[PDB]
Design a binder for this molecule. Structure first.
Ligand SMILES: C=CC1=C(C)c2cc3[nH]c(cc4nc(cc5[nH]c(cc1n2)c(C)c5C=C)C(C)=C4CCC(=O)O)c(CCC(=O)O)c3C
Ligand SMILES: C[C@H](CCC(=O)O)[C@H]1CC[C@H]2[C@@H]3[C@H](O)C[C@@H]4C[C@H](O)CC[C@]4(C)[C@H]3C[C@H](O)[C@]12C
Ligand SMILES: C[C@H](CCC(=O)O)[C@H]1CC[C@H]2[C@@H]3[C@H](O)C[C@@H]4C[C@H](O)CC[C@]4(C)[C@H]3C[C@H](O)[C@]12C
Ligand SMILES: C[C@H](CCC(=O)O)[C@H]1CC[C@H]2[C@@H]3[C@H](O)C[C@@H]4C[C@H](O)CC[C@]4(C)[C@H]3C[C@H](O)[C@]12C
Ligand code: FES
Ligand code: FES
Lengths: 359, 359
């Protein structure tokens, strides 16, 4: 039976093989929204050519590529299974992957959705916490696709642009934290200090009103409440690159710091993303828990499992979508407010594309 | 009946009159908890004599000095009435005011509590969101005192060192917001944008590990939940001074930004303090809502009323203590963890002072 309701799962994406590395850097650097380069159409391809080795090396050290497609899919399948059962008048459901910077590209997936002749399309970001650099960008990609192509959308669109405190999302996190706690030696369970590590931002983006830091902060608190404050915590930020100021403290600096001060049992909890990817498999597990931790005198260091294939995250996804359909919401109230200091003419356009949709 | 339990309400303070402005600044600049100035004992007396006229002129602009004590007092009487009826086991309850930089000073308050022969002393911060510049500084004073004085405490000690999301505190902010939304023209209510405005911290404090941003953000979220996201929002930060980098967006920049983008209806909600003080009556109500937004084209800017005399906030305060007392805790789990990049030797000592009280 032909697909009625499409769910576009948005994520930035990662290179699947080492061969996909160059074209991933290229799209990243060609993007005027993300970075502003002099002679951008000449520099981007050369900067990418030069950075490819450094980055292949990173995927090399985790086994040759990203797994976000495998997990994103596995999540998709469970979601659809559930929804067709939760919501028959909107069945059958299909999921589509819209990676921002690798195949299948956002623009490629939208192309398929229209082709399948769906009635309703739901843009569903896989970042629980909104940032203009992530979700903002995927949403812009959609507006741009229909502007680019110069035709109207043949489906009734909407978005779940954020959901940083979803009750089941909160649960999956708590369960993974708890069960990982049970893996620390009993004589240190109480001593365990928790570091919620989220992808950092450049200060210039923060200072502009990006809604991310407040939302990631919102999530941490909700999880800690469910844990009944069983251990102390901190929210720290990973992934700074280059000399400019970014939001702190730095996940690494914070690891070293605590070690120097005798807090040698650190559990790392990846709160800003739902699946494994480079930020956990290389940055946290290798460059931090392996080396760093070795040269700082660490005792135990562990990393709560990413949600990945946990069936409860499946439920979370179906629940969100289901409720979103039950509410007739077109986008969060939050999306209707662009960052107070936003330059970038397109943000308004996108916000209008979503609030203006038919029905 | 002599007092049994003593409730030390901690807060930074503000000059009660134009004449108190000098000593207030002199005491801020002498704090090794906040300012590392060369030859500090000589610099601060100068840097005060110098800044004093600027600061006086501000208080003038708001009637003549700080309302902090008037509100702290009242809030305190209400809390005690209720406590005596909620927890009669703790016998008569007395409230003491410990301001950090004006009389009655924490030091003075501790003397008075001592020579009252209380059985129990509670260090209650009047800052729901913990920062090492606010609550920490108050707590360091409690320790520093009993250490300098050579004696040891003659009464059981403990702290409610934080409470960013206490449900009655949430009810109060939401209640004032709703009330303030009824003062906008009907036709503009849904178009009202909310800015929660918290006193900012310098980036170096944020980057060092400070709890504040994550907690403030927690509060914002709970408050917006209760309001069921009726209007869009951002969390923004006020009161930057000097040339160094601070956590933004600056609140002023945000007002002016929203305004330039045609979001010309704004409701300021001070979310990190529980009374009027200089930051609201001058900064927000006068430099921002009067001078600034007038020359920017603003249609309506209001400010949610500070918690002040709200009887329900009194209940909140009593509610926090009754629970603190019944649960027997000495402090939060969060206090038992210092900033990962903390460089201040007293933070260890102060934590110990609380984690290790008898009973
Ligand atoms: C390290 C982090 C912080 C530093 C270094 C800090 C420094 C200051 N705080 C001041 C005043 C103040 N700070 C105040 C509440 C806070 N202050 C806070 C965080 C900081 N405040 C937080 C968090 C607050 C509560 C939310 C208030 C209410 C005043 C009143 C100052 C005045 O003019 O009376 C002044 C006056 C300086 C001047 O010359 O104008 C300085 C320098
Ligand atoms: C670090 C990297 C150069 C890689 C290398 O020399 O190995 C450069 C090239 C493009 C840069 C990015 C772009 O300048 C855009 C961003 C602008 C912000 O103010 C800094 C971070 C920001 C996200 C940059 C981070 C980093 O410096 C990048 C990624
Ligand atoms: C891959 C490259 C690092 C190159 C280097 O270390 O030399 C980095 C530098 C800035 C990065 C970007 C910034 O972190 C901003 C975005 C943050 C998201 O978590 C991923 C996509 C996101 C768009 C990043 C893509 C990619 O990881 C970039 C472009
Ligand atoms: C600008 C003013 C001095 C002006 C004068 O001498 O007349 C100075 C005096 C003490 C300063 C503070 C001290 O330098 C200590 C802090 C150091 C941080 O890097 C910035 C905030 C910080 C809290 C400063 C803010 C601001 O620059 C202050 C308030
Ligand atoms: S940059 Fe955030 S809305 Fe445009
Ligand atoms: S500065 Fe935060 S604990 Fe010392």
């Amino acid at each position: 039976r032909k697909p009625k309701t499409g769910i576009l799962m948005l994520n930035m994406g990662g290179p699947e093989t080492l061969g996909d590395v160059h074209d991933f850097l290229l799209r990243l650097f060609l993007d005027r929204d993300l970075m502003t380069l002099p002679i951008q159409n000449k520099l981007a391809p050369f900067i990418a050519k030069r950075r490819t080795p450094k980055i292949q090396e990173q995927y090399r050290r985790i086994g040759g590529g990203s797994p976000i497609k495998i997990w994103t899919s596995k999540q998709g399948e469970g979601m659809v299974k559930l929804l067709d059962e939760l919501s028959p008048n909107t069945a059958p459901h299909k999921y589509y992957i819209g990676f921002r910077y690798v195949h299948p590209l956002t623009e490629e997936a939208i192309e398929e959705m229209e082709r399948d002749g769906l009635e309703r399309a739901i843009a569903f970001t896989q970042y629980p916490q909104y940032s203009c650099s992530t979700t903002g960008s995927s949403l812009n990609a959609i507006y741009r696709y229909y502007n680019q192509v110069g035709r109207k959308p043949t489906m009734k669109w909407s978005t779940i642009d954020r959901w940083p405190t979803h009750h089941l999302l909160i649960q999956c996190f708590a369960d993974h934290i708890l069960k990982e706690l049970d893996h620390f030696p009993l004589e240190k369970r109480s001593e365990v200090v928790i570091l919620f590590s989220a992808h950092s931002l450049p200060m210039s983006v923060v200072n502009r009103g990006d809604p991310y830091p407040q939302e990631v902060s919102a999530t941490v608190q909700k999880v800690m409440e469910r844990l009944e404050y069983c251990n102390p915590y901190r929210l720290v930020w990973q992934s700074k690159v280059g000399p400019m100021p970014w939001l702190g403290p730095q996940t690494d600096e914070s690891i070293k710091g605590l070690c120097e001060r005798g807090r040698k049992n650190i559990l790392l909890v990846p709160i800003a993303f739902t699946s494994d990817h480079i930020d956990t498999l290389y940055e946290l597990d290798i460059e931090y828990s392996q080396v760093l931790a070795k040269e700082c005198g660490v005792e135990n260091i562990r990393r709560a499992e990413s949600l990945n294939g946990n069936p409860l995250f499946s439920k979370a996804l179906a629940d969100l979508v289901h409720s979103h359909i039950q509410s007739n919401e077109l986008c969060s109230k939050q999306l209707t407010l662009s960052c107070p200091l936003c330059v970038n003419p397109v943000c308004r356009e996108t916000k209008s594309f979503f609030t203006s949709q038919q029905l």
